[PDB]
Nucleic acid binder design. Structure first.
Ligand SMILES: [Cs+]
Ligand SMILES: [Mg+2]
Length: 407
DNA sequence: GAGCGGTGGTTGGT
DNA sequence: ACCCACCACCGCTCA
């Protein structure tokens, strides 16, 4: 669920992470904060094959991507109300990211962080998060189009734009379409009533009128239900396309308790949100010797090769992350810039081509582990890094480069 | 989760 | 007793 929702609210805007991240960093003068439901991995991560722990491995590579976007993730886990939590939590930590346990459903807790200002956006499996208070929700972190390769884009959904848009659906309206047409907890709903007639009741306000009703008031329900049931068997207001005389409404319906599960979901306590306001983001500091230990054991990246490869794979990410904390000791991170580009894979975010020493940047020496065309972690390597990030961490190397081009 | 073609049911009109 | 378009529901397919 919700089956067929995107025909009503639109498919979302397909934008890249880079652009969302650098735009935010430009307007708000600090990195984008993202609550990531941990359910997105389950059925996207188990397609890698070979080696040791391919599921954990793609998680590893996506975390290195999150570093290179300069994004501050908080990773959210379902509570009591394939990829292993323990592992995963340990790797979230080695990367200097944050792991958060929801009291109840992760989707609900995410939306709640966003609406409390702990994060600026939710990245989820779908837009269920909108029924839960979400305003800016992402889905489908994935390669762009048929270009089969790097996962660079997400699909962005904007609750305020949807509610104003052709479908008019808002949080209270969708919730009504979930009750009748089916959701996670009540996959049935009103039998025989699907998305098209449910969206027609939502734009007739029936979703507002019910989310405003307490469950105690029993008198108010019947007036609402009898009213709704009457427009259904008659279509007196023209609320719908046709008339549904045989569309049976169950006695239980509406199930307020299931309704309340959306309108007042089990989310963290106020004290938890307070703790979060002060502890997130934390000191984003990647544990280098920790990742080394992890990768040797988890991925069988053993001895010098493994060390080399961990250096190559993590150095561009560590450069971005170092830039956003930070005579000319800018050189400790960047040796030079060679070129500029506004590539479509970032919706044309300006990038500069930075030269750097991988092994020096990471801090590992491969000669201190056993030795058993090639990549030399002491030669310069070259990454494309967003300009806006370079001007914050290495301002004078950008200026020098900028003067070189004028000349 | 989401798309897609099929199937069977409801409505309004032939 | 038929069509007709629309819809809702099913089963499969890809992750
Ligand atoms: Cs239904
Ligand atoms: Mg869901």
């Amino acid at each position: 669920g919700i089956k067929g929702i995107y025909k009503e609210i639109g498919s979302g805007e397909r934008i890249s992470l880079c652009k969302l991240a650098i735009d935010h960093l430009e307007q708000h003068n600090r990195p984008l904060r993202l609550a990531i439901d941990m359910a997105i991995w389950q059925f996207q991560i188990q397609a890698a094959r070979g080696g040791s722990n391919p599921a954990i491995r793609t998680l590893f590579y996506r975390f290195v991507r999150l570093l290179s976007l300069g994004i501050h993730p908080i990773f959210v886990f379902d509570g009591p109300n394939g990829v292993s939590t323990a592992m995963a939590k340990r790797l979230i930590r080695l990367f200097g990211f944050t792991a958060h346990d929801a009291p109840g459903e992760a989707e609900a807790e995410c939306a709640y962080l966003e609406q409390q200002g702990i994060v600026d956006a939710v990245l989820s499996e779908d837009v269920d998060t909108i029924m839960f208070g979400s305003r800016v929700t992402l889905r489908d972190w994935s390669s762009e189009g048929s270009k089969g390769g790097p996962p660079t884009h997400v699909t962005l959904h904007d609750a305020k734009k949807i509610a104003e848009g052709p479908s008019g659906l808002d949080r209270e309206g969708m919730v009504l379409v979930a009750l009748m047409s089916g959701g996670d907890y009540l996959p049935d709903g009103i039998p025989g009533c699907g998305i098209k007639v449910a969206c027609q009741a939502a734009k007739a306000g029936f979703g507002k009128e019910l989310c405003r009703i307490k469950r105690a008031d029993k008198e108010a329900i019947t007036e609402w239900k009898q009213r709704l049931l009457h427009e259904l068997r008659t279509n007196e207001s023209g609320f719908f396309r046709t008339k549904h005389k045989a569309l049976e409404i169950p006695e239980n319906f509406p199930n307020m308790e299931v309704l309340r599960y959306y309108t007042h979901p089990v989310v963290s306590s106020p004290a938890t949100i307070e703790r979060l306001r002060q502890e997130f983001p934390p000191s984003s500091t990647v544990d280098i010797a920790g990742l080394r230990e992890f990768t040797r054991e988890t991925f069988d990246w053993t001895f010098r090769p493994g060390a080399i490869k961990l250096i190559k794979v993590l150095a561009p990410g560590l450069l971005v992350q170092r830039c956003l904390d930070r005579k000319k000791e800018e050189s400790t991170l960047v040796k030079g810039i060679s070129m500029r580009r506004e590539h479509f894979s970032t919706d044309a975010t300006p990038e500069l081509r930075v030269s750097f020493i991988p092994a020096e940047l990471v801090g590992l020496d491969p000669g201190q582990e056993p030795e058993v065309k090639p990549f030399d972690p002491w030669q310069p390597d070259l990454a494309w890094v967003p300009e806006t990030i370079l001007k914050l961490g290495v301002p004078v190397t950008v200026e020098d480069w900028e003067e070189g081009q004028r000349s």
